[PDB]
Symmetry: C2
Subunit: 326 residues, 2 copies
Amino acid sequence: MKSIAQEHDCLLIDLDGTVFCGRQPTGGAVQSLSQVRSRKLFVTNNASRSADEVAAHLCELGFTATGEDVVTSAQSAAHLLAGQLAPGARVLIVGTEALANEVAAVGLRPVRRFEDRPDAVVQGLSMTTGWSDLAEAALAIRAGALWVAANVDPTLPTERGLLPGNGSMVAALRTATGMDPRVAGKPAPALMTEAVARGDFRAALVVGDRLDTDIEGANAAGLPSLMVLTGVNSAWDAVYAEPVRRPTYIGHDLRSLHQDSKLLAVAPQPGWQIDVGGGAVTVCANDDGLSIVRAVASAVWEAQRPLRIEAGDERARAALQRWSLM
Amino acid sequence: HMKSIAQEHDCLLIDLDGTVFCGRQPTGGAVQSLSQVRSRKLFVTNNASRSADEVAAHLCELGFTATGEDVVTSAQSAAHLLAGQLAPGARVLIVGTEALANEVAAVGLRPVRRFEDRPDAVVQGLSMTTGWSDLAEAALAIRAGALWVAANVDPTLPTERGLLPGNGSMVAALRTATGMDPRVAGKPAPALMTEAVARGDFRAALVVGDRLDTDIEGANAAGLPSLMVLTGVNSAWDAVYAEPVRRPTYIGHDLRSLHQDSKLLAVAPQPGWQIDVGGGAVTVCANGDIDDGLSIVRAVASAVWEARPLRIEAGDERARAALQRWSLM
Ligand SMILES: [Mg+2]
Ligand SMILES: [Mg+2]
């Protein structure tokens, strides 16, 4: 019975676009996270900061967290490597020392150039990575070194604009070497599947702003998922999402944790009558404000050319236009 | 009495790397060959890291006679391109060496290194101290509508240490970050070559190069003839199976071929080799009643180009030995 946060052991929660939007914590994020009893794990695909450094930034925004609460893709990459390299194998680092620490912390030996004999290469974003560093990695990868990337985001959003992400640095090595790296962070399920293993949790939940990492990774991990609308992807994006990227729950922001799990769920709605016609989904009337989104989403998924969403009365049109959809 | 290929031409647009020298050492007979040509020797490179004088200095060390005026770079062609569609004094963000920036300055545009300055264009070339913050600056310019030019799009820089990331790898990072492509100013874009003949009003230029996708592709794009040499990247196999736009007109071992007959070097049918094209195979036999060792390459190439991938088989022993010498089988 009761709220969704109570129905689940622990929450794997995305940071960026979910907890905080750059400088500021999200809509009622601080208030809402203090009121859950379930174990809160902060999940980030970024590998530039270390475990503590991320927790410090949370503390500066008014949240209570330490490094043991945070799950980075640098940590998951470290486990991946140690999972298939001899103890004290040499791993060439591309990225910050926060990355190289996690390599050391799993009993491997972080290295910085190709004349040292690295059995693998790990790659995460660092704002001082230069050509010289890529060149060392390029030689290593051409010689058959095992290549891991923390994440493969093409862009890094900031106040100045959309800057090059780790995926862009990976794209340079892809071109130089003609090979791909194995991706360690989201949307790979190992990151999430390990996080639940830490505290042997039997009923975990994923909360994130982004379909192609947070939600896609949840389904890959065989976990449920609550999509929030404070970040990258929109209501529209959820409706037309391809099967592997479809969330199970959907809500405004982190106040959704204290809402009823049956209310947030993507399913048919008694408040909305929907008819899938010839190339169109039609909505008539009979709520936090997202019921109609859940109604339409559910219809499209159950059912190629994208289906048009269209209105059957004044009450439908106004709600739809409020969420775009036409 | 016959006439050499170099005598038949006003000027020679000669590629540096893989053609004149191979990293440290001049290629076979390069110094002795170029010293014996009367016509104008221009040294063309797609690299935008060295200045024209720095290139010429490097050539003097290896044993060649060359000044800065003899060098044609993609950095020059990139600058000329930008000057040709930007107002004088327009700001151009530089990704690359100061030698790149100097070429931009020299055409009356203002070289720049960051997005807070308002750059109308981004020019990209390889520099070994290029870092993420430099790419970040250019990413912001490109997204803000800035005109983007690259010197070259080479995935790799070949060095003594191995294969390092070329300018094409750096571009790929911006291709991914921005979702846009640069306009290429260097080879195989014909602007580079066609402007070089304009410099001296030459009326019978020839291109010499080791690479099909740049040197040769550009020569066909510029409507110039072209000698492919086997000292560099592309081989005889590559010549044979090259698609129409990357086909050379002449083919030789190395820069010695500048003194051989153009009729001998020409990709054409050969007296010493009879060819049967049929059954998805090219059968080569030794024929009935002087070779430089490449007649069979020219015969096969000519046969393949005149006519679904095609196999190359030997009809007798002599032909098999010749074919095996150039792989081909
Ligand atoms: Mg996010
Ligand atoms: Mg070359």
